[PDB]
């Protein structure tokens, strides 16, 4: 299991791209490709995990814990105390996987603690403990991922809706980013401020597993039947063919079965 190093406190947009890059190359199954498009892996190929490493402004960190599979966000570890590794998986992880998660983030045990997440992954739900109706009610930036990290990192109690919000604006950056290279350009585009998420950013996020399985299916290059997506301004956009969607998606989900490589 890989941790991939990423310092939110001090870049600039090739650090950003060369991150993304990586986590992409270290998540992407070597060989399974469908029309240009790298696959994520079968729940069988080890590692199944990918750790990252979230450096921000004043020695606070958190790493990340991502499944291959999905790229799944499946809980964070920071550093607390003197020299304690503090764990939080999230509600909707469970059986081997919740071991996997206190092993593989502290993986020295005598020094590790608990702190659970107590929800779930799932946009809905962080919304409702952020306290908002839509995720574009709150803004993502590096700037934002920093004080963020300056929030949660080795702090004794924080609350729920702060807890959320650094949420929603990780899996957002890094999970989204590294699936989407329009989501990634969208984050270039704005590096110097924060922003609010597009009806276009919103809807990939949504449609990545309809992506993943259209692309999949294409038979010589047109789509089984016409793929309804949601463009930047918020119009209805209508695709028929993988060279219309595929300059936008940098990885695709695992969908089991044969398809056109290259
Ligand atoms: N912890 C997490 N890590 C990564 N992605 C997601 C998501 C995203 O939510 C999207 C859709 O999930 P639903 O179809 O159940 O609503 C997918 O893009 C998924 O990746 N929710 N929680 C996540």
Redesign the pocket.
């Known amino acids: 299991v890989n941790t991939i190093i990423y310092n939110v406190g001090s870049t600039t947009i090739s650090k950003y791209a060369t991150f993304l890059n990586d986590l992409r190359n270290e998540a992407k199954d070597p060989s399974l490709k469908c029309y240009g498009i790298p696959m994520l892996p079968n729940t069988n190929t080890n590692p199944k995990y990918v750790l990252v490493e979230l450096q921000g402004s004043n020695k606070k960190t958190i790493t990340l814990m991502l499944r291959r599979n ?5 809980g964070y570890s920071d550093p607390f105390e003197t020299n304690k590794c503090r764990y939080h998986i ?1 509600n909707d992880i469970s059986g081997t996987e919740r071991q996997d998660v206190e092993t593989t983030l502290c993986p020295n045990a005598n020094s590790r603690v608990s702190k659970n997440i107590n929800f779930d ?4 739900t962080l919304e409702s403990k952020a306290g908002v109706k839509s995720r574009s009610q709150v803004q993502l930036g590096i700037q934002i991922l920093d004080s963020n990290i300056g929030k949660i990192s080795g702090v004794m109690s924080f609350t729920e809706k702060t807890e959320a919000e650094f949420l929603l604006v990780a ?1 957002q950056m890094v ?2 980013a590294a699936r989407f290279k329009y989501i990634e350009n969208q984050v270039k585009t704005n590096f110097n401020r924060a922003f609010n998420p597009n009806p276009k950013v919103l809807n990939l ?2 449609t ?2 309809k992506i993943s399985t259209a692309i999949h299916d294409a038979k010589n290059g047109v789509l089984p039947k016409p793929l309804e997506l949601v463009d930047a301004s918020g119009a209805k956009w209508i695709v028929l063919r993988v060279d219309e969607i595929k300059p936008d998606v940098a990885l695709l989900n695992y969908v089991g079965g044969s398809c056109q490589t290259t």
């Open positions: 999905n790229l799944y966000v499946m999230f992954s799932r946009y809905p899996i999970s989204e996020q949504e990545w597993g």
